[PDB]
Design a protein around this ligand. Structure first.
Ligand SMILES: [Mg+2]
Ligand SMILES: [Zn+2]
Lengths: 225, 49, 104, 49, 338, 168, 48, 96
DNA sequence: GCATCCGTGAGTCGAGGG
DNA sequence: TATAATGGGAGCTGTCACGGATGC
RNA sequence: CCUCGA
């Protein structure tokens, strides 16, 4: 589904370029674009082909969600939900209250919603995830190091895949693996099958596990010692 | 007095235990029939009745 | 009906009991309406009317033509503390919880 | 049962070896790695409930 | 839900290449790289910067980042300036720009069309320390290398040449990422050769081999001691949460007894130094490095007190002598020598 | 000063980077021979702190006279080793990632703020569907694309790169 | 025995699969020098 | 554990006992000077061998561990004073 | 309004054996 | 560095009570 | 994890 535009002279757009109706294609401005689309310059057929396509910004993942969260103007949304709170329907007032509670929490706290997405992942001090020589001279180490190493390998492979101009599918796969790495680091098992070390069915112990439960930090070392 | 190169890591009787020594086993690297986990030179087991 | 630790836990957690009594939302007089195959109890005020449809084998605490308080039990069983709170108010529920726990 | 599981792993490795490697020269010994079966028996006897 | 199922579906979207489509895309890639070299010849620009600008415009403004090797930061302004310098050339010099653009697009579609082969090869390397998807992505890296290096004129299929690089990348990833304590490639290869040797020896002996048997089977240069040290270096750590770490004391932080013992040692050394003159106590403290943390030379302490190094050495000697006398007398500092 | 309150709040990427003493660029722990920490790895003394009291990694400064001084040769601060319990590091992400607490704790705070359902937020975050930020006047099935629309993969391909087919 | 369907070639060998722990006279085992017991398990029988 | 020359666990319920008795100092002692307040426990042992009364406890080390693990969760946990101005339980050793 | 799937809890202290 | 090779594989499930989203 | 003790 495309539109052909033959050219007799030097062309002003190359392959891949995105273009709108009424743009300069070839012959010094003579033959122009009718339709919205993307340009294939056929040098064999000597025709500038324009395949119908838009310049849509449609993204995936935490990058997209972070943008949509940066965009949010809180006070406006608060006003909208207040206008919603006057609705006769009880369920609409219920949903508006549930949302407005979050909105006003962010408002009064001075927190930015976008911070619920991570750019710089923190890293725990090493002594809290030790690498120690046990009695017999062998080595023993916390699970957090294996989770962090997973994260760093995937992050670095992503950086290199980007620098080397990888196709879309490959970058999508790498970004998905990266999200799941951060997932398993922060709260392993929460989404998807829990990450395990090789040759064992034992879930690695993430930060959430360190904090909560009867064996967690609070009940095991803070409310009792 | 010069500080010695090595220090005392000997195996002592834990608090609240003791008795009569009735057996000693000694395994050494480089000795017949004896191969230990990598890095250990020798193993010594003392039995206390 | 429940005894022991399950009843105490049921009370301290403010759970709606499995076999729960049915209580009157308002005052009024009791008019019993029993078909051979179906049963209902009506609390009739001077200007208002409340209809409670309950399974036929439920035991009534209630004679025909008696004056029942708001939140008074009609059927036997445990009382839903939240229905009691909505009907009769806080002091009543404080009373009910303390006494029901102490029974055990 | 644990023997059966270790054998299943040994057979997965056997097929994985049958796809790789020289198709003309293969013995039973070149095909079979016993280690997973050993592991299954070792875990059943050391760490089973 | 399940990420490998998702990836296999996304891969099953792009259809497989026929001989003609494959050869065409590979040809376009070759001629586009040649066109980039020609654009470097004409423009005097950097071939890598030209390649990055052509690539940038092909993919979109969605991805333009800083490439490590480039001397210039790659941002939409510089790529616009460079693309306008590349659009301002004569028709026969503007031909190579279109060739390069087509080459980039062909390269993209070639990788995407061959992504199933990486899965079919990586499925064989599971259980080696890396997740299925990690093996897949490292194989995709190798596939990218193979696309950039492939030569269609040799008439070989692309699967043949790509398999070599895909295996190379998967194996490099295993050898570089599997161990929590990282080990160099050659050392990993030596360890795996050791393992195969030991396994063959146990298969023929009906028992696990000794260090000496492995060394003999390993050839010259290998003795029992070297087999032992190699296995010792290849030992991998174990989990603290097996918990297993709750039996592990802290040798680093000084115990309360040790802290109090050093406290009483400092206090008793000062008690003993007080029985000297302030100058000889100060000479000892400077020579032992107590005052500023380090020990001064005799010339520094002597210039500090304004005296000859022989004199300050004699003052230190007599101070040490009076200390030895007081200590032999009161026997106070004896216990602290262990 | 005496502790009176304890506050807890979300941490901004800038705040996180302010905690950090260095970025962990390599998934390396310690060296297989020296057993010492690797450069730019998870245990590096250049970031987290000295392993021995008042002694840099290479040994050029071994005493408390140097306090706060950063050795120029090995890049290790001369200070107490206790700091390896305290100093944070960080990892800089090629692409941002969602903190799963604010995703999977129902009802999702992120999903509540953006009026996105659990399913939709999952589909965007784990790369099953596109969310549109600007339609640039796109059209799907005759309806113009509205912002925050949920596009499948076929839809996004048909709109962004056009429709086509090949027949044998 | 290894059998190629096409070649018809047949190569057979006695391969060593490792060791199986032996039960002692009294019904116990010795695993890594320590005597151990395998406890019977009760469970729901297969069936309909 | 007896083999590790271990200490007895003073769990949540023992804490409840001490709270019920109102023995604030006994309990604070259990929580700081006797377990994981490092400066506190060293100073206490030295005080007792010197015949001195025990020094006032300070922050238990596992609370600092909790704070650092919450920072690892990308949550900022601030000890404040009554003027709502931060207090440094790490004594500057974790700030650049 | 009422069924249904998901997540999260379910005593302590010991000892040993690992 | 070149024969060609193109979508995984493990999978037993005897609790229960709570809030909350999801549907009819 | 298990078994054991209160
Ligand atoms: Mg030899
Ligand atoms: Zn140094």
């Amino acid at each position: 589904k495309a539109r052909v535009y033959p050219f007799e002279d030097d062309v002003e757009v190359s392959t891949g370029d995105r273009v709108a109706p009424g743009d300069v294609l070839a012959d010094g401005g003579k033959v122009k674009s009718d339709v919205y689309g993307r340009v294939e310059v056929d040098l064999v057929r000597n025709v500038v082909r324009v395949v119908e396509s838009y310049d849509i910004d449609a993204r995936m993942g935490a990058e997209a969600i972070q943008q949509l969260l940066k965009e949010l103007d809180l006070e406006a949304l608060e006003k909208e939900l207040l206008e919603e709170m006057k609705h006769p329907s009880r369920a609409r007032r219920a949903k508006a209250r549930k949302r407005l509670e979050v909105v006003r929490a962010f408002l009064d706290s001075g927190n930015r919603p976008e911070w619920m997405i991570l750019e710089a992942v923190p890293v725990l001090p090493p002594d809290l995830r030790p690498m120690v020589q046990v009695d017999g001279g062998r080595f023993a180490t916390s699970d957090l190091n294996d989770l962090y190493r997973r994260l760093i390998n995937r992050n670095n492979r992503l950086k290199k895949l980007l620098a080397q101009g990888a196709p879309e599918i490959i970058i999508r796969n790498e970004k998905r693996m990266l999200q799941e790495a951060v997932d398993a680091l922060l709260d392993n098992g929460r989404r998807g099958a829990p990450v395990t070390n090789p040759g064992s069915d034992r879930p690695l112990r993430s930060l959430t596990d360190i904090l909560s439960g009867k064996q967690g930090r609070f009940r095991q070392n803070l409310l009792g010692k | 007095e010069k500080a010695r190169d090595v220090k005392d890591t000997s195996l002592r009787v834990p608090p609240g235990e003791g008795g009569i020594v009735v057996r000693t086993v000694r395994l050494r690297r480089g000795d017949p029939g004896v191969e230990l986990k990598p890095g250990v030179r020798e193993v010594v087991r003392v039995y206390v009745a | 009906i429940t005894q022991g630790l399950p009843r105490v836990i049921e009370l301290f957690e403010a759970r709606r009991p499995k076999a729960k009594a049915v209580i009157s939302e308002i005052d009024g007089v009791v008019r019993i309406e029993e078909t051979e195959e179906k049963l209902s109890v009506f609390v009739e005020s001077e200007g208002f009317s409340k209809e409670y449809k309950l399974p036929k084998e439920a035991r009534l605490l209630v004679k025909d033509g008696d004056y029942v308080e708001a939140g008074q039990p009609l059927t036997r069983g445990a009382i839903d503390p939240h229905q009691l709170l909505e009907a009769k108010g806080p002091e009543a529920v404080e009373r009910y919880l303390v006494e029901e726990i102490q029974k055990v | 049962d644990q023997f059966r599981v270790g054998l299943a792993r040994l057979a997965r490795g056997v097929r994985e070896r049958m796809l790789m490697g020289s198709e003309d020269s293969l013995t039973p010994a070149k095909l079979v790695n016993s280690r997973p079966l050993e592991a299954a028996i070792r875990e059943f006897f050391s760490r089973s409930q | 839900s399940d990420p490998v199922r998702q990836y296999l579906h996304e891969i099953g979207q792009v259809p497989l290449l026929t001989l003609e489509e494959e050869v065409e895309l590979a040809r376009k890639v070759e001629e586009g790289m040649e066109a980039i070299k020609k654009l470097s010849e004409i423009t005097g620009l950097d071939p890598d910067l030209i390649r990055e600008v052509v690539r940038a415009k092909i993919l979109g403004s969605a991805r333009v980042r800083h490439i490590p090797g480039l001397k210039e930061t790659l941002d939409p302004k510089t790529v616009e300036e460079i693309d306008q310098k590349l659009k301002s050339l004569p028709k026969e010099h503007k031909r190579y720009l279109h060739i390069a653009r087509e080459g980039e697009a062909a390269r993209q579609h070639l990788i995407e069309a061959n992504l199933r082969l990486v899965v079919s090869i990586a499925k064989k390397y599971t259980g080696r320390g890396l997740s299925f998807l990690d093996l897949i992505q490292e194989g995709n890296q190798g596939l990218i290398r193979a696309v950039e290096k492939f030569e269609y004129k040799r008439r070989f299929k692309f699967s043949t040449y790509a398999t070599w690089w895909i295996r190379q990348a998967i194996n490099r990833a295993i050898a570089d990422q599997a161990r929590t304590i990282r080990i160099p490639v050659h050392m990993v290869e030596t360890i795996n050769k050791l393992s195969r040797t030991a396994r063959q020896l146990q298969q023929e002996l009906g028992r696990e081999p000794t260090y000496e048997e492995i060394a003999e089977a390993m050839g010259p240069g290998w003795d029992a001691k070297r087999v032992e040290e190699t296995l010792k270096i290849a030992q991998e750590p174990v989990s603290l949460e097996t918990f297993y770490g709750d039996f592990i004391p802290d040798e680093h932080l000084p115990s309360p007894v040790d802290a109090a013992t050093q406290s009483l040692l400092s206090e008793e050394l000062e008690k003993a130094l007080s029985k000297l003159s302030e100058r000889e106590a100060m000479v000892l403290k400077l020579r032992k490095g107590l005052i500023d943390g380090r020990e001064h030379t005799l010339e520094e302490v002597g210039a500090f007190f304004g005296v000859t190094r022989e004199r300050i050495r004699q003052i230190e000697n007599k101070a040490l002598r009076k200390l030895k006398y007081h200590e032999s007398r009161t026997r106070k500092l004896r216990d602290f020598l262990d | 000063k005496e502790v009176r309150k304890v506050r807890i709040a979300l941490a901004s990427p800038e705040k996180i980077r302010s905690w950090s003493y260095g970025e962990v660029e390599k998934p390396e722990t310690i060296n297989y021979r020296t057993l010492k920490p690797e450069r730019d790895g998870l245990f590096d003394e250049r970031i987290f702190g000295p392993i021995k009291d008042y002694e840099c990694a290479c040994g050029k400064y071994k005493r408390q006279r140097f306090e706060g001084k950063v050795c120029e040769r090995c890049g290790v601060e001369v200070t107490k080793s206790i700091v390896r319990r305290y100093r944070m590091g960080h990892i800089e992400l090629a692409t941002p990632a969602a903190h799963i607490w604010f995703v999977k704790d129902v009802p999702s705070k992120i999903g509540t703020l953006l009026d996105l359902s659990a399913t939709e937020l999952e589909q965007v975050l784990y790369f099953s569907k596109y969310i549109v930020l600007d339609p640039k006047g796109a059209i799907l099935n005759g309806v113009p694309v509205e912002k925050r629309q949920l596009l499948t993969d076929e839809e996004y391909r048909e709109l962004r790169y056009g429709k086509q087919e090949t027949y044998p | 025995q290894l059998i190629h369907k096409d070649t018809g070639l047949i190569k057979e060998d006695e391969v060593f699969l490792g060791h199986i722990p032996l039960m002692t006279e009294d019904g116990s085992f010795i695993i890594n020098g320590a005597d151990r017991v395998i406890v019977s398990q009760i469970h729901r029988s297969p069936g309909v | 554990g007896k083999a590790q020359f271990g200490g007895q666990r003073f769990g949540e319920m023992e804490v409840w006992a001490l709270e019920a008795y109102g023995a604030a100092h006994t309990l604070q002692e259990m929580l700081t000077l006797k377990s994981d307040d490092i400066e506190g426990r060293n100073a206490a042992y030295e005080a007792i061998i010197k015949g001195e009364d025990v020094p006032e406890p300070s922050v238990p080390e596992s609370f600092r561990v909790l704070v650092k693990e919450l920072q690892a969760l990308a949550l900022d946990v601030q000890t404040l004073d009554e003027k709502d101005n931060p207090v440094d339980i790490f004594e500057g050793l974790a700030s650049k």
